Amino acid sequence: SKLEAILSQEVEAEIQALLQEAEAKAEAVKREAEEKAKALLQARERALEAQYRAALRRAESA
Binding site for another protein (CB under 8 A): 57-58, 61-62
Residue with Cβ nearer another protein (1 or 61): 61
**How many helices (H) and strands (E) in the chain?**
1, 0
DSSP 8-state code for residue 42: H
Residue with Cβ nearer another protein (42 or 51): 51
Q: Cβ 56 to another protein, closest distance in Å? A: 11
Q: Is 32 helix (H, G, I), strand (E, B) or coil?
A: helix
DSSP 8-state code for residue 1: -
Q: Cβ 47 to another protein, closest distance in Å? A: 17
